[PDB]
Design a protein around this ligand. Structure first.
Ligand SMILES: O=C(NCCc1ccc(O)cc1)c1ccccn1
Lengths: 412, 412
């Protein structure tokens, strides 16, 4: 029968820092990680800024010889995974290696690498494609390379559900443990889509903020002057562990994962329905899964992408799920500061949701100068809000009408 | 306790045919779907052949306008999925749509789209990138488009575990139903990596057969003259359904899905361990999941890719798991005929495993002229073998050392 699941380890690369503590300090201080992009020439692009990981040293984790073969999204996924496993204190042994698995996902995966090999192919010929093109680019190789480096022989897989990837990855990994398929899972996501095709492709869809002259103010969830999401890079990883397994080894437990919801909108390939019907169905699934009264929800880490339709849909969904209690909880978008890490969004935001529980503070939605029509909830505008948080919820919505909700609570 | 899961609908595009019955007819006749790749300059490539889908008409499924928005791998996934849902007779209603979900995956995703948008980007700059580039290329859009078209509001996700994708998708969809998160799931995979990038990428790793003079003899699993896998395109979709749900509406039930196993090799990025230790753990996990003794297995659809190390690892794993029963079962690689559909391999091979149960026949391993050292199992060389089959396994072993096994049983 269904086992309980706790968080014993966390790891992160974000536009705010090269680990969890440094990222979280930036979150609580309302600091933006968004800046003009330096790694390529974007003069022909309508968007020239994003959330870059600054000063990442892969040789903190891997040999330069191995790193050369891997896309940045794999390098970032391994770094966050390595941090989370170390943070857990867990020792991998012959006695437990078959019971530890990994589910690290990505929305787009190795687009930089595929673009660079596509350039080699077109300009030179197929004989210049890297021998490592496939294993260095395809999305399942975070899970693959992590298992090879740590000796994890448990369930080994990868989700790809666009902007919902990190949330689904964590939820489904919790279900693996819940149902006895594993005792430990390393789960989350990673993304590095800041190449020509990434910035160009989201640009062609007119999905991105074009506030090139003020990048720190571009990401402005629920602000009436928002004009699209900000593209950001990085990784989140959590060590999920069966409760009795955690208790037995004396693990430090950050929080319990009590609820997971998924729902499809079945509405539109790219647009969320204005009323948030799919997001509402997903949160209600997650709250029922957790055995909660919705009035127990203290904090919501919103998807909050800073799109016109997405941000208002989320207000509508929260009002419909929580009714009068919608006015008592706090809801913030850390994407105000980090931008949109796409497949990694749900992973870093799950970490921010757990840290909201550890520290009893709602992170701010920075840049919320003029809340839009109907955006009249506690959106923690401008400044972190210390407050009682027993139950935190983290939402993600994605292309294909794909929704995920995670429910965390304090563990005593 | 756990709900029972049955197969009530199947759909396919393969190198043998544009549906299940035409593909299966080719399989039992020992026909090859492999041929030189057309309408593509492969002059500078060491491999010039593969398994193409021949005569696919997307306008049987989509308007020209919707099909223009979608990579071939998505078109193929949608074709298989629509076929599977039609084949099932299922009526989607307001009363059941929240209980019907989708998990259609891909190993490599939108390489053909990425290739064509790279052309535009390099030649003319980013403003010629298609608006639909991102939603038209990301792996979760088969699940996304299918859910939107049919109004499916159940779990909506996509796996990407390289050559294991189709097996994991079906297995994890079966878990969703067994543990009551859904009553119906459309599950499987789709793949179209016959671009410069797939042929070039696998070619750079010298992973492909280069037998250009005799494409139909290239894929020769367990034959001493094999020289790597054959790249193939297509899709498989299954309608998975809770047993009481299927019986209440009078569904035609092909077979029961009794067992699902996962494991990680934790060994190498592209090569399996010589003894197939990971594949052995995975099959043992799948049989434990089914409550079955290795002795009860009659038929194995092998991964059987025609790689030197892969084929020999699978013989070792089967001998290890099945002891004195290893010769009694029949094991064949339908990849001898279809080539390797990568992420769709597990989906089309689950369908072939189900049909081996319906028709009491083991598909052939064609081209097995000279079994290699230790390849002395019943590999159904050359010709289909009518025989008793109560229990059929389907194995997938992919990059990152990610393993999947499905156990199907006759239903009466
Ligand atoms: O290597 C790292 N972590 C893995 C720890 C580990 C845990 C269990 C085990 O059995 C083996 C290794 C790392 C490196 C730099 C920064 C953070 N973490």
């Amino acid at each position: 029968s269904r086992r309980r699941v706790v968080i014993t380890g966390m790891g992160m690369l974000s536009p705010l820092g090269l680990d969890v503590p440094s990222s979280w300090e930036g979150i609580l201080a309302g600091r933006s990680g968004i800046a003009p992009i330096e790694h390529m020439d974007l003069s022909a692009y309508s968007t020239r800024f994003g959330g870059s990981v600054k000063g990442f040293n892969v040789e903190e984790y891997l040999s330069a010889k191995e790193a050369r073969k891997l896309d940045l999204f794999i390098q970032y996924g391994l770094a966050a995974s390595f941090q989370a496993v170390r943070d857990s204190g867990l020792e991998v042994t012959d006695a437990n290696r078959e019971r530890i698995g990994v589910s690290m996902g990505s929305g787009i995966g190795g687009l930089t690498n595929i673009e660079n090999n596509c350039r080699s192919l077109f300009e030179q010929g197929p004989r210049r494609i890297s021998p490592f093109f496939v294993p260095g680019s395809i999305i399942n190789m975070v899970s693959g390379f992590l298992s090879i480096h740590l000796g994890l022989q448990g369930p080994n897989y990868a989700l790809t559900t666009a902007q919902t990837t990190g949330t689904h990855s964590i939820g489904m990994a919790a279900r693996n443990i819940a149902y006895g398929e594993a005792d430990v899972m390393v789960a989350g996501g990673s993304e590095m889509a800041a190449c020509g095709l990434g910035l160009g492709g989201f640009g062609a869809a007119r999905a991105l903020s074009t506030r090139n002259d003020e990048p720190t103010r571009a990401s402005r969830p629920w602000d009436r002057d928002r004009d699209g999401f900000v593209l950001s890079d990085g990784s989140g990883a959590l060590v999920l562990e069966e409760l009795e397994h955690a208790r037995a080894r004396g693990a430090r437990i950050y929080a319990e994962l009590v609820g997971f919801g998924m729902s499809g909108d079945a509405f539109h390939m790219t647009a969320p329905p204005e009323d948030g019907a799919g997001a509402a169905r997903c949160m209600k699934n997650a709250l029922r899964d957790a055995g909660l009264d919705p009035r127990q929800v203290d904090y919501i880490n919103a998807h909050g992408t800073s799109t016109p339709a997405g941000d208002i849909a989320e207000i509508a969904a929260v009002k419909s799920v929580f009714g009068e209690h919608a006015h008592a909880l706090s809801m913030s978008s850390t994407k105000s500061m980090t931008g949109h890490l796409l497949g990694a969004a749900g992973a870093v935001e799950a970490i921010f949701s757990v840290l909201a529980l550890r520290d009893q503070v709602a992170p701010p939605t920075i840049n919320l100068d003029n809340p839009d029509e109907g955006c009249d909830l506690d959106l923690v505008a401008h400044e972190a809000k210390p407050r009682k948080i027993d139950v935190a919820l983290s939402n993600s919505f994605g292309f294909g009408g794909t929704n995920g909700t995670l429910v965390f609570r304090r563990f005593a």
